[PDB]
C-alpha cells in the first residue's frame, strides 16, 4: 500500500495473509468470508508467465495478523488449505479478467477480536455503493512504493471509485465489466494505491444502511503504483458472485 497508514488493531479482522512455507515468503493478501472460506485473486495461485501454479499443499493462510513478520501467538491463527478453486474463465493470458479464487480451509477457524468475516454484497448493496466518487478501503502488507520498501504492520488506505470511462481511457490494457478501478485523479490533491504484494486483499466499503463492512473488490493489477493518471484495478466481487455461490454449493 502506497501513501497509507498503519492499521489499528482489529481494524480489518477479515484480512488474511497467504504465506509460502519454504522458502518463507509473504505471497499475497486474501479475505475471510466465513469460518471455512477465504477469497483471493486467481493470479496469486495461478500465473504461468511467472512459473506460478500452487496446489493446496503448497501454501498456508495466516488469519488475525497485524505484524507482517512476527509470529503473533495466541492472536493469529494459521490454517492449511483443503482445496483451491480458480475461476474457470480466469484470463491469465491477457488482462487478468475474472481474477478470483476461493480457498477452503482444512478446519473451520475460531473467531475472535482479531478474526471475523467480511460480508459479500447483495445485488442491491452492490448497485447502491459501487458508484464513482464514493470511497472504499484497501489493506495489505505489500510494497510501500513502486520498486522492496515493506511495512512492519498492516497498511490501510481509503480511495475513491473512478468512473468507468476514466478507468478505460487511463490504460491500453483491455478492461472488462469484471473489473473496477479506484484512486485519486491527478489534481485531486491526495494520493494512494495498492502495490505489489497487496493482490488478493479486499477492497471494502462500509454500508451506511446497516453499518456492516462489505467486500466489493479484490486487489488485482495496475501499472506501477500510485502513478499520476493511473488507477488501481480490482476484481468486481458481486459480478462474480454466481461463481462463488456455485463453488461453495458444490465444494
Amino acid at each position: 500500500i502506497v501513501e497509507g497508514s498503519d492499521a489499528e488493531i482489529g481494524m480489518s479482522p477479515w484480512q488474511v495473509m497467504l504465506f509460502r512455507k519454504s522458502p518463507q515468503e509473504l505471497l499475497c493478501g486474501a479475505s475471510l468470508i466465513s469460518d471455512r472460506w477465504v477469497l483471493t485473486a486467481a493470479h496469486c495461485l495461478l500465473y504461468p508467465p511467472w512459473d506460478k501454479n500452487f496446489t493446496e499443499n503448497d501454501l498456508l493462510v495466516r488469519i488475525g495478523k497485524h505484524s507482517r513478520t512476527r509470529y503473533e501467538r495466541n492472536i493469529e491463527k494459521i490454517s492449511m488449505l483443503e482445496k483451491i478453486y480458480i475461476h474457470p474463465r480466469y484470463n491469465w493470458r491477457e488482462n487478468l479478467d475474472r481474477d478470483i479464487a476461493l480457498m477452503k480451509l482444512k478446519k473451520p477457524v475460531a473467531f475472535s477480536d482479531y478474526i471475523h468475516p467480511v460480508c459479500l454484497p447483495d445485488r442491491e448493496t452492490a448497485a447502491s455503493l459501487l458508484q464513482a466518487g464514493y470511497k472504499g478501503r484497501v489493506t495489505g502488507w505489500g510494497n510501500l512504493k513502486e520498486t522492496k520498501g515493506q511495512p512492519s504492520v498492516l497498511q490501510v488506505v481509503n480511495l475513491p471509485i473512478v468512473e468507468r470511462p476514466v478507468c478505460k481511457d487511463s490504460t491500453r490494457i483491455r478492461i472488462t465489466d469484471n473489473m473496477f478501478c479506484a484512486g485519486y485523479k491527478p489534481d485531486e490533491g491526495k494520493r494512494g494505491d495498492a502495490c505489489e504484494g497487496d493482490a488478493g486483499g479486499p477492497f471494502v466499503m462500509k454500508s451506511p444502511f446497516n453499518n456492516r463492512w462489505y467486500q466489493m473488490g479484490i486487489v488485482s493489477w495496475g501499472e506501477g503504483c500510485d502513478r499520476d493518471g493511473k488507477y488501481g484495478f480490482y476484481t468486481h466481487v458481486f459480478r462474480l458472485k454466481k461463481w462463488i455461490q456455485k463453488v461453495i454449493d458444490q465444494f
Partner: peptide, 19 residues
C-alpha cells in the same frame, strides 16, 4: 445469502468488527 451447511458459520454477523 449462502447456506451455512456449505458456507460454514459466520455470515449472519459478517462485517461487524468486535473492536
Amino acid at each position: 445469502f449462502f447456506n451455512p451447511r456449505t458456507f460454514g458459520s459466520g455470515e449472519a454477523d459478517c462485517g461487524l468488527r468486535p473492536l
